[PDB]
Every structure is written in structure tokens, then in C-alpha cells.
Design a protein around this ligand. Structure first.
Ligand code: HEM
Ligand SMILES: O=C(CCCCn1ccnc1)N[C@@H](Cc1ccccc1)C(=O)O
Length: 454
């Protein structure tokens, strides 16, 4: 089969199609028009966007396809280095850091992070308890305060103290600005044109800000000798069972930067979309709130109680189905191969997995794919293979999946226990796009149930 291709712009091919505020949503509309696979060309680039479970289940065959660095991840590598997210599978530091960090991200390690997650979650609840009568909540903003502070505390015992600020910590300002520059660079045809000399100069300044703080944090920890229950301690002490080597200080820095750029935005986006769908579906909200009240019987949630928030977990998965906050990942063919019995690929050919469109495959989910129904996730065995991929695939899947879902389940559970929520503006979903997706301008009012935290 000849695969379809969206409209072209002469020598720029398809590139101008991504010169828009909402490129993922533009790609979703193209998939609606062209189907499960389309070619996408830019100067010096060819890829193929996949949208059907039928083809993506083959793309997830690790014997045939390996992780590719998208252009987006290639530009993030300028500050995330050879951290886990922006490393090639064949780089020595990927397998080393992977082996060392897996035990630090397990479901069992969440038991040790739980107290620190509760610390920040309680700060969120207390902020909302302290709002005056007809004040409102800026949801994505507060969720980002929470996830940034949680990763900072669990990552390297550092308090960004985001709930004490209107202006973010200087590291966060530089990180956000570096991510924005990485995403903006996806359109420039003459990078060395002197017109962008200021962007380049600003980009380097933000990189130095992040490195200096993280390098200082590492140096301070080695100088104090203190042992915490954070990822930094595990990385200073861990040894790769395979090579027997530890991570060096440079790679440890890249991992810390990666944890912050990799998990803060996708996780706050998940919480924001989850709360959005809950207030738009009051029957679902009531069911989730009933579970929270039944399970969270103590002033502070325990680790075990979070595991019992089954329906809250399904709410989070259904929010990830409709709006997976990490919207795509990239693959390359390890050898010549045929995709779906119709599209021959040569060794090295690239694929993009368009996750929000995969999750709308009506052959998998039925005709009501746009409806928010957490009950779809009652039984993981009922879900066909590779139909649900918000955390990527295989050995290159999200190492932070357990962390993100424990944090989100804890916080969402506490939110549902302590407040009733009002969609007081009848908010119209508007999805802002960066590296990730989030509902911009989403606001609610939260009326306290007056349940103490002591
Ligand atoms: C809802 C929350 C999250 C979502 C949807 C998500 C999504 C993803 C996806 C799709 C990938 C695969 C990327 C690719 O193949 O190019 C990935 C990888 C990764 N994620 Fe997440 N993530 C989340 C939270 C987190 C958190 C909280 C952390 C750290 C605290 C984290 C750290 C990482 C790392 C290090 C990788 C690279 C793993 C490797 O290749 O070895 N993520 N994530
Ligand atoms: O593929 C990625 C990078 C996604 C990173 C996912 N992620 C987030 C955190 N961890 C992982 N963008 C997609 C979509 C896109 C296209 C143009 C401009 C912006 C976005 C693409 O290039 O087609």
C-alpha cells in the first residue's frame, strides 16, 4: 500500500503543519482524515505517524523496533544529556542507569517516598482549605506546584517551596524556558542565521543555571555524607550489577534534571485532566468521592490505603486514555521489516506513535471513545495488547510510572475526601501544548467538607 500524506508546502514538505500552537491536536486531525498511518516529511526528515492498535502492536515489538530520539528529545538532550529519557538504548549510560534506578522506582520503593509525597499533598490541601469564600483554584498551576515539589523532595531532598511563591524557583524558570526553546526550535530552517543569536545565548544561560544548582546539590550531598530516602542517595551509592560501576557525577546530574523535566509536567497534566473529567462527569466524581471517603479513614493516607483507591486509579487511567500527557514516542526499525503486511520498512526507518489517537481506536474501545468511563479499566486482561500506551513501551517505558500513579492517586484521593468541587465557569477545554499537554485556564471552586488533617 501507498501510505497517505497530508498537504505539502513545496520544498518545506509537511513542516509548516507543525508551525501551530497545538501541533499534537493538528496531527490528531490529520489522523482523523488520513487514517491509521501517514507519512510526514520535512527537510532532512521522514517519519510515519501511527494511530491504530493494529499497527502500533507491531511497532511495540522490541525485536523489530527500538526507541528513536524524536527531534524534540534530541533538542532536550542539550540539557538532559544522556539521562534515561534522552539516551539511546545502545549508550552505555542508558543500561547502567536503568539497572541502577529500577529498584528506586519500584512499587516497593514507593513505600519509602510516601511520607514525602504526603508532605506536599498536605500543603496542597491546606492551601485550598485556606481560600476565602468565593476565591477559586487555578488547577494546572497548583498541580504543577505539587508535582515539582514532590519530585524535588523525593528526588534529592530539596524544597522548591512552590506553595510559598507566585514566581517559581529560579531553576524552574530556567527549566521551563529551556523546554520552551527546545520545542520552538522545531521550525527553524537556518539555525545559524545570526537572527537567533539571542535565543542561542539565552538557551546556554538556562542550561548553566540548571547545571550549577544540580551540581551544587550533588557536591553538597557528598560533602555532608548524609543518607536520605531520595533518589540522589540511591545514585551516589548504587552499583550497576552488570558492569559493577556506579554513575558518575555528571550522569547523576543529568538524571536529576531528567526527573524534573520528565515527570513534573506529565504528572501535573494528568491530575488536571483527571479533575476536569471528574467535574464534567458528576456521577463519576460521586463514585470516586465515595471511594475516597470509604478508604481514607485516617487523618493522613497510608501507603496501603492509596493502593486501595481502585476506582481513583481507574479514573486516572481513563484520563490518560483521553489525554495522555506525554503525547508521543518514536521508534526506528532495527532491520528491514513489513508493518501490518502492507507497509515495507527499511532498516532505520522511523515511526511516531500518536498516543491520543491510538486511545481513540474505535475497534478497541467502541463507538463511545470520547466518553469518560473509568469502568473501561476494571480488568487489564480485557484490554488488547498495546492498546493503552500512556507510559511508552518495553524496556524504554516510563521508569516513573509507579511514582506518577502513586502521587496522582494519593493527591486525587485527598482532594476528593476533603472538598466538593464546582465547575463555576463551565470551563471550555483548551489544551495547551508544550512538550506535554495540559488544560489551560482550568479553574474550579472547592468547598471544604471540614474534615481535619490532624
Ligand atoms: C502521567 C505521568 C507520566 C507519563 C504519562 C509519562 C510518560 C512517559 C513516556 C510515554 C515515556 C516513554 C518516552 C519515549 O519512549 O520516548 C516515558 C519515559 C520516561 N519517564 Fe515518564 N511519564 C510520566 C511520569 C514520569 C515521572 C514522574 C518520572 C520521574 C519522576 C518520569 C521519568 C521518565 C524517564 C526517566 C523516562 C525514560 C525511561 C527510559 O527510557 O529508561 N516519568 N515517560
Ligand atoms: O514526540 C514528541 C515529543 C514528546 C515527548 C513526550 N514526553 C513528555 C515527557 N516525557 C515524554 N512530539 C510530537 C508532537 C509535536 C510535534 C511538534 C511540536 C510539538 C509536539 C512529535 O514530534 O511529533
Amino acid at each position: 500500500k501507498e501510505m497517505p500524506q497530508p498537504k505539502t508546502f513545496g520544498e518545506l514538505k509537511n513542516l509548516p503543519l507543525l508551525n501551530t500552537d497545538k501541533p499534537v491536536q493538528a496531527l490528531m486531525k490529520i489522523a482523523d482524515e488520513l487514517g491509521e498511518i501517514f507519512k510526514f516529511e520535512a527537510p532532512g526528515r521522514v517519519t510515519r505517524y501511527l494511530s491504530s492498535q493494529r499497527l502500533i502492536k507491531e511497532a511495540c515489538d522490541e525485536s523489530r523496533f527500538d526507541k528513536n530520539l524524536s527531534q524534540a528529545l534530541k533538542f532536550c538532550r542539550d540539557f538532559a544529556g544522556d539521562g534515561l529519557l534522552t539516551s539511546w538504548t545502545h549508550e552505555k549510560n542508558w543500561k547502567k542507569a536503568h539497572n541502577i534506578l529500577l529498584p528506586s522506582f519500584s512499587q516497593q520503593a514507593m513505600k519509602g517516598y510516601h511520607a514525602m509525597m504526603v508532605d506536599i499533598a498536605v500543603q496542597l490541601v491546606q492551601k485550598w482549605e485556606r481560600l476565602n469564600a468565593d476565591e477559586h483554584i487555578e488547577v494546572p498551576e497548583d498541580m504543577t506546584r505539587l508535582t515539582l515539589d514532590t519530585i524535588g523532595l523525593c528526588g534529592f531532598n530539596y524544597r522548591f517551596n512552590s506553595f510559598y511563591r507566585d514566581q517559581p524557583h529560579p531553576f524552574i524558570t530556567s527549566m521551563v524556558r529551556a523546554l520552551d526553546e527546545a520545542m520552538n526550535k522545531l521550525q527553524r530552517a537556518n539555525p545559524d542565521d545570526p537572527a537567533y543569536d539571542e535565543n542561542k545565548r539565552q538557551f546556554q544561560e538556562d542550561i548553566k543555571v540548571m547545571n550549577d544548582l544540580v551540581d551544587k546539590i550533588i557536591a553538597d550531598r557528598k560533602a555532608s555524607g548524609e543518607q536520605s530516602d531520595d533518589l540522589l542517595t540511591h545514585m551516589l551509592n548504587g552499583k550497576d550489577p552488570e558492569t559493577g560501576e556506579p554513575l558518575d557525577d555528571e550522569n547523576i546530574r543529568y538524571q536529576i534534571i531528567t526527573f524534573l523535566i520528565a515527570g513534573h509536567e506529565v504528572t501535573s497534566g494528568l491530575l488536571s485532566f483527571a479533575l476536569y473529567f471528574l467535574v464534567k462527569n458528576p456521577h463519576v466524581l460521586q463514585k470516586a468521592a465515595e471511594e475516597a471517603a470509604r478508604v481514607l479513614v485516617d487523618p493522613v493516607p497510608s501507603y496501603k490505603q492509596v493502593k486501595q483507591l481502585k476506582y481513583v486509579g481507574m479514573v486516572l487511567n481513563e484520563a490518560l486514555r483521553l489525554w495522555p500527557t506525554a503525547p508521543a514516542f518514536s521508534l526506528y526499525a532495527k532491520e528491514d521489516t513489513v508493518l501490518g503486511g502492507e507497509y515495507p520498512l527499511e532498516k532505520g526507518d522511523e515511526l511516531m506513535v500518536l498516543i491520543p489517537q491510538l486511545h481513540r481506536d474505535k475497534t478497541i474501545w467502541g463507538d463511545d471513545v470520547e466518553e469518560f468511563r473509568p469502568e473501561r479499566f476494571e480488568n487489564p486482561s480485557a484490554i488488547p495488547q498495546h492498546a493503552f500506551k500512556p507510559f511508552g513501551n518495553g524496556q524504554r517505558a516510563c521508569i516513573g510510572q509507579q511514582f506518577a500513579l502513586h502521587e496522582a492517586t494519593l493527591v486525587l484521593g485527598m482532594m476528593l475526601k476533603h472538598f466538593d468541587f464546582e465547575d463555576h465557569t463551565n470551563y471550555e477545554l483548551d489544551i495547551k501544548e508544550t512538550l506535554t499537554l495540559k488544560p489551560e485556564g482550568f479553574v474550579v471552586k472547592a468547598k471544604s467538607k471540614k474534615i481535619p488533617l490532624l
